[PDB]
Subunit: 1017 residues, 2 copies
């Protein structure tokens, strides 16, 4: 019969029937607006006014009640019109009437609510304010569903939808704010203050917060179908204190502390009660509580003894989880306060259970007349209290004092019955399980709700790895066969990566957005949602806070029944949006330049995951477009042989050993490239390609880019007017150092000239042993035309390369002449047939060094790439290689150069042949006892030239001598940056054998070549 | 017929029959020692001498061959004795002969090997050295298995077992070292140098490394039963280069680079060959290779074109994976070298396949007579080459030059056939899969093996989280029903945490030891093992490097068939060792003091995981002991109610609200405690307990300790002579900040005195809101007696507390007297019946402050704990509370104190009642227009005293006035750190009603109390 009774009846309706329709519209009239007079509105104001002890100003109060009246009358019209329209949807008069009534309803409300929020009296007005706002939200939510069907145009529906969500927030934040400051205003130091304080809290939770808690569910778009919330907050009664005919000083903090702080929800299993005695008055002195987690999903637990052990009588375990729990307490109080020792306790209490039928009430000692049901009344008056109660007993703590006065004041928590002992998932509606109904909290806290949630929330803390915040909720599924998408309501001040598990499998893991800008004063719009992409049928549900850095508030888990067509639709929209975002324009004719080749690959992946069972028509369509995008990417890609199909087959890819092409990957979806290291720095692993001038456009930046799975020591070159080069090390990822796998590199074209034919060299190099790379999706592309500084830089670069060429082209005319003449002086001039008789090796070597002083025969960066001067260097060095060949053939001495180490030589001591300047091999005689010798056949009577090219380290003299058996021995002697002397002599063997013998006196002797030749002109 | 043929025949035996027994002993004689003369040993030396071009010194060489001979003769005796003993194990003569022959065999070998390792010629001796060492290891491995059965005593078997493992390392490191420096010694700049170089490498891999690679398997204890290894190394042939009748200058680096660097193993699928033409000579100009990963577990891949495309003739795909792969190439070479252009290529090659039957050979163009089978001969000569080959063709790369001379020199990799195309797991032997046979390498490299592994290894790099190094190997199980323990051979320089997965499940995750002290020059003993604890029956196998910091080399995976009894045994030993390590001594009578209660809990967990099917007898036994340990822990534990069964039931645990006891946990196995925060700092969450002097021993340190799952703001107190206190924050873990969950805290006892009864207070406190702890397994224990500094510190602490008491005990005699007299002055002296007529509130308040200047009525740290002065403070404050009660009852004014705010008062303006010093409530008149008034009933004719206690802020005068209707109004006026004035007057009502009215002129007026009293003596 009181506002709390009325609220609880709305609360039940809102929990059980929350779904757009005539049942809803009709529900509000029957419960409230159709059946309330001005005395009912008066009654509501008095409830809070009495409490806070100050009445609303009369004009304001008068204004308030006549508005509420205006609205009863209005809404009755809207409801009656709604009803009739429902019965005949197509009747245009019934529809116009719907439109008009809606408009008028929206006017009145917008105007009347500010009059229920009037300064200085916001508090005593709140619950009624809450009423008008609950109603405002539903008409807005109506028009957003039925608007179209009534004849409103989309423009006007979205405007009023935007209003709807603007106002879920506003109205909620308002109520919550004034509840707070009303609550604080009524706090005070004594037990009397506490009674008013708690009574405020309890009454206003019942007529205010509970409704507000349901306000989100008006979001038609978030909650298209029936959606069931659960209120988990606790409310408190305290018999002893609540009708103590006095007040205990400075006790209200002590009393308030005897309420349990924020916890995971638990079921009250039993109370075991201790009787003590004072002047032959027997009383409840202490007691003990057992409890279980939600869903008896854990073992039971307990708490330290409340109050004090007593032994005046046996003790009495009262079991609470029988039927549906305890819904009522009838308590006997005792106050002995004899004229002058003092007593304030309970001598008995009945605990009564909720049942669809009947259960004997468990009595501690005796019943009494301090009925809890005055304070926590039933929600349903169509049945006995045992059936129609609103609350279950949740815990019984205690405020105590001890040995001048005795206080034993048991404190009763009542949780709302919408808080089910188990977490059962429906299948025809969205089910809301608040995270607080969980049973495993690792690295995080429960912290009291701000009022607009129905209860407390879960904080998961920031990390690092094995310290991830985690909340686990047990959940039962009546219907196995039902497919659900999970949605989570959360709050964070930063974007956080979150993983949601279901059973042992992880159904969501990505970074969700921020929603707030501080987690301390939490406002309605501070919360948000995310959902799994798919829908499924394990038996628990969980969230993990992956962030090392920030925390996250988890409100509630939401299970959303879904058909397979719905599923296929969600993913289609998602993928359709992806493909479209590749193109510049609405006609899909061009790619956005900053869309990379690899990106187009990620997006195509999305398409192939679409159902073949429900989306084929519209999936094929999408795959047309993404293939089309890709084709356009290949069009803009200026590199030949993109997929490395023809490396080395010259005008495509140039490549070395230590490369590998596999077709695909964890990362790559197309042919890609693996490069491994080298054992010698001079023999690098290289993939290169020239880009033809004819494909380039003047005065334009170009961009080399691609994707590297991972990398170490990867050397990347871009070469036109000069070479730029990155070294690139990129670690892999799972699912100095580059944090990104995308790379890019820019170069700028000046004037293009086909005749000069610069182009752009693209070169990938690895010159170390540990060393590697995995890359693909390589593009070379046109980016932007050159403007401002970049332009003047390029003009400077070309101009500067232009000046470097002229220089080079001048110095090369000198040197070539010089080298070419030195080359010619080696030969008998008759076209590369013969060496002059008297040209020696040092000469060949000297000519060689004049050839190798040619500066751009080969590109510095990678010397397999011919330079400006490749043509002319090449011909001269071949004339040189011819020359060494001729030197060798004519030498009557086998291996006189030491080019084959020591073969064809007879060696006595310790001697070595070491290479010194290019292929050039030298004999080292390190000690005088060593002897290198060769027997040579000759033509007796002919004449020979013995030529030695060598030098002498240190003291003494090096010798090459020559002889036959007995008298005919002759000698070449050497004594004294690194340069050789050439000596010779004429020898005339008497016989058919000669001996050549190399030796020395001391120090070290070094011989380049020993030659023996016929004198023949 | 050559040493390479002989080696390959041993190699096959060692791969296929590696198992202790007579088959093994008999195998070595038949293959080697029983059938070799001195010419065979000569032959071996010549193989390497010819190669390195320098013969061994004659004495050394002579010595060497006669030792090898001594050993042929000896081992023939040992083998014949082994054989005969096998046939009749119990015959004591056959057993004595076994013992003797073993001793002699061990002597000869120990003496002869140093003569095969002689300075200056270690290299040319190596392979023969390898032979003698292979043999040494097996006799050692024999005696370690059969030793006991021959009659050797355990002392001598373990000595020779220790020798065995000492020498697997030594002999391996030796061989490997000299292979290295022999190989380097023979490197050189030209193609000729390369031929010798590679020929060395290839021949010495075949006669040396391969054997050495098998050396570990001699570890009887690691390999109790048959164990099969796989050689994965590649060897190389190069037809063109290998019988080029000359040498190409500075080409050996170029040639060497045409060998593939370290890779995951792959199967050669096909070669597709390009014919070109030069002067109407048709040649192999280029070619392309396809390959697949091991087990065709991946898609195929390819490589950039080898050589150069040619079009002189069609092109020719030759398929390699037919039969068992290509085992042979017969190659035609071409050398045009016309007197003066140059050519060095192949004009044809036959590829022949390995089959149990027959397959036509695929011919490129034509066969030739450069048979690969001269270089890579068969292992089995009991069958045609097609069946008995040792190698499969593995890859064909190329060394090239191009457009003076042309070189097209295809390079053939041969992998040993023990490298199976698939990774098949046997069931009757241990199967060794080298990690290199994997198909997924993430964050790591393959790097060339050191020689003693059979092939290359896998490096997994240091991290951070989604960059864990990982190696995945595909594996087939012929027999589903077989149970295997996985063992991994690895190397690391630090202890690393490693996770091994099998299929999708993770079968090992813990930190394994270091084995090495640098990963660069890897020695035999640098490797180690770890194993899963259990044994299982997924289809791949993997290791992940969990370290953020260090790298790890993975060699090979080892699968070990096991029965269920074996399993149950492994875990029993493991748990038996755990339980024993709890006790001080061999009689399990005492606990080791540094074994914590929680530790005993971890160890009991280990016991409950033992099989009930195979271990019951010996598991029950173990559970007796661990329960016994635990019982002893409770014995030493000096805390009452360890498992928090009786908190608050006073002489056990003292506890507040916001505590919870659950029975067990992810962490705790026994009753444990959860504390949550507080809303007010003055109302903390507390668990405390005193420890009785009678349980303490003089001059001894004690230790408080326990385990905290997690914690924040946990305040821990230890109190005797003074209080020490930690604040403790401990993050949780998965499976300022404390990195450990174990805590401890120490205190020291001086002299114990039962009369003074200090004890030790143990207090857990949380005084903040965010704030929590989860702890259990709490012990208070005796640690050690006090010695040295600690002793003199404690003597100082007690002495100092002793001096603080005397002080306290002196000051308390003064104050108590003072306070007690002030208390008494309040009363009419007749036992606490009445207040003196003229004692006012300020007096009561002044007396109160003299009571509350009592210094240790309550323990500072937690004021629920009575102090020295709790008794005397308590009585006096009750006399005070009596006094306030009396003040109130006699005041004819209702609520004249403002202790119930403003009730019983009529208020006109804005006025407030604020609490100021304890419960003391004051009326604040802030403005002159305000009016607080009360109508009081009186007895006409009697006489009353109107007393006011108040003061005046600022200007003007505060008034309390009193009156009846018309002429009888009188007044108390107040004008002018925080202290009150008391005024009064005598009033005599003519009527039955009086009015009391509080007011003021301006400024602010503050009233403590207004009292009206009858004058009655
Ligand atoms: Ca030379
Ligand atoms: Ca007062
Ligand atoms: K906020
Ligand atoms: K152009
Ligand atoms: K090492
Ligand atoms: K004692």
């Amino acid at each position: 019969y009181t506002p709390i009774d009325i609220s609880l009846s709305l609360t039940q309706f809102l929990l059980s029937e929350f779904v757009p329709g005539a049942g809803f519209v009709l529900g509000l009239v029957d419960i409230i607006w159709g059946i309330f007079g001005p005395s009912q509105w008066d009654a509501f104001l008095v409830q809070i006014e009495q409490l806070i002890n100050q009445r609303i100003e009369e004009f304001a109060r008068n204004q308030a009640i006549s508005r509420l009246e205006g609205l009863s009358n209005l809404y009755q019209i809207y409801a009656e019109s709604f009803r009739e329209w429902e019965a005949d949807p197509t009747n245009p008069a019934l529809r116009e009437e719907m439109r008009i009534q809606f408009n008028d309803m929206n006017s009145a409300l917008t105007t009347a609510i500010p009059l229920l929020a009037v300064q200085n009296y916001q508090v005593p007005l709140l619950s009624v304010y809450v009423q008008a706002a609950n109603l405002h939200l539903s008409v807005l939510r109506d028009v957003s569903v039925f608007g179209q069907r009534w004849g409103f145009d989309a423009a006007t529906i979205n405007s009023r939808y935007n209003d709807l969500t603007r106002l879920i927030g506003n109205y909620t934040d308002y109520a919550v704010r004034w509840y707070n400051t009303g609550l604080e205003r009524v706090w005070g130091p004594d037990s009397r203050d506490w009674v008013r304080y708690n009574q405020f809290r309890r009454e206003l939770t019942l007529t205010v917060l509970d409704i507000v808690a349901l306000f989100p569910n008006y979001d038609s778009r978030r909650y298209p179908i029936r959606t069931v919330s659960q209120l988990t907050r606790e409310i408190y009664t305290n018999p002893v204190l609540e009708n103590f005919d006095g007040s205990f000083r400075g006790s209200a903090q002590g009393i308030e502390r005897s309420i349990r702080s924020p916890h995971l929800m638990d079921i009250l299993n039993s109370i075991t009660i201790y009787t003590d005695a004072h002047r032959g008055y027997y009383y409840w002195s202490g007691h003990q509580i057992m409890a279980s987690p939600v869903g008896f999903s854990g073992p039971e637990f307990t708490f330290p003894l409340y109050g004090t052990m007593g032994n005046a009588a046996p003790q009495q375990r009262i079991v609470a989880q029988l039927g549906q729990g305890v819904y009522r307490t009838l308590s006997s109080t005792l106050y002995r306060r004899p004229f002058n020792q003092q007593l304030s306790v309970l001598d008995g209490t009945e605990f009564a259970y909720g049942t669809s039928s009947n259960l004997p009430s468990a009595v501690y000692r005796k019943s009494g007349t301090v009925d809890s049901l005055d304070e926590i009344p039933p929600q349903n008056n169509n049945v006995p209290p045992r059936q129609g109660f609103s609350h279950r007993l949740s815990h019984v703590s205690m405020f105590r004092s001890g040995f001048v006065s005795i206080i034993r004041a048991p404190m009763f928590s009542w949780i709302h019955r919408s808080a089910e002992v188990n977490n059962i998932i429906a299948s025809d509606s969205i089910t809301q399980i608040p995270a607080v109904k969980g049973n495993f909290l690792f690295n995080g806290s429960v912290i009291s709700g701000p009022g607009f949630t129905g209860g407390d929330l879960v904080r998961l803390n920031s990390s690092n790895i094995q310290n991830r915040g985690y909340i686990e909720v047990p959940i039962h599924f009546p219907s196995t066969s039902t497919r659900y998408r999970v949605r989570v309501r959360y709050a964070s001040v930063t974007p956080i990566h979150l993983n949601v598990n279901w059973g042992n499998s992880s159904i969501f893991s990505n970074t969700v957005p921020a929603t707030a800008t501080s987690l301390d004063n939490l406002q309605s719009s501070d919360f948000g949602y995310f959902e799994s992409a798919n829908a499924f049928t394990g038996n628990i549900v969980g969230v993990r806070n992956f962030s090392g850095t920030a925390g996250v508030i988890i409100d509630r888990f939401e299970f959303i029944p879904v058909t397979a067509t719905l599923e296929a639709e969600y993913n289609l929209e998602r993928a359709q949006k992806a493909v479209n975002a590749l193109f510049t324009s609405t006609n899909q004719l061009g790619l956005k330049t900053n869309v990379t080749d690899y990106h187009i690959d990620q997006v195509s992946n999305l398409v192939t995951y679409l159902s073949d069972e429900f989306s084929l028509d519209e999936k094929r369509e999408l795959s047309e477009k993404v293939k089309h995008a890709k084709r356009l990417s290949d069009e803009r890609n200026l590199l030949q042989d993109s997929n490395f199909k023809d490396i080395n087959r010259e005008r495509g890819w140039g490549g070395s050993t230590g490369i590998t092409i596999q077709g695909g990957d964890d990362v790559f979806k197309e042919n890609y490239v693996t490069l491994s290291g080298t054992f010698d720095e001079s023999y690098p692993t290289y993939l290169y390609q020239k880009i033809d001038e004819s494909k380039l456009k003047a005065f334009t930046r170009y961009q080399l880019r691609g994707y590297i799975e991972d990398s170490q020591d990867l050397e990347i070159y871009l070469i036109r007017y000069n070479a730029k080069h990155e070294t690139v090390n990129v670690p892999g990822t799972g699912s100095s150092a580059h944090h990104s796998h995308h790379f890019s590199l820019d170069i700028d074209v000046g004037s293009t000239d086909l005749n000069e034919d610069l182009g752009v060299w693209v070169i990938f190099k690895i010159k170390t042993q540990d060393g590697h790379a995995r890359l693909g999706n390589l593009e070379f592309l046109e980016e932007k035309p050159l403007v401002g500084e970049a332009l003047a830089r390029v003009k400077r670069a070309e101009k500067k390369w232009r000046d470097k060429r002229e220089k080079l082209e001048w110095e090369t005319n000198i040197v070539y002449k010089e080298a070419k003449e030195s080359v010619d002086a080696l030969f008998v001039n008759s076209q590369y047939d013969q060496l002059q008789a008297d040209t020696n090796i040092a000469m060949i070597h000297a000519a060689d060094k004049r050839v190798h002083s040619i500066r751009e025969a080969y590109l510095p960066e990678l010397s397999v790439i011919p330079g400006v001067n490749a043509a002319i260097f090449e011909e001269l060095e071949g004339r040189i290689f011819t020359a060494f060949s001729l030197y060798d053939a004519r030498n009557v001495i086998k291996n006189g150069d030491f080019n084959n180490g020591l073969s064809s030589w007879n060696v006595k001591g310790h001697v070595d042949v070491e290479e010194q300047n290019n292929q050039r091999s030298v004999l080292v005689v390190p000690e005088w006892e060593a002897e290198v010798s060769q027997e040579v056949r000759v033509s007796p009577g002919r004449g020979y030239i013995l030529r030695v090219t060598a030098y002498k380290e240190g003291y003494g003299e090096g010798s090459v001598t020559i002889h036959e058996i007995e008298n005919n021995t002759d000698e070449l002697k050497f004594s004294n940056p690194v340069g050789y002397v050439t000596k010779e002599l004429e020898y005339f063997p008497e016989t058919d054998k000669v001996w050549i013998e190399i030796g020395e006196t001391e120090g070290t002797f070094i011989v380049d070549s020993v030659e023996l030749l016929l004198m023949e002109e």
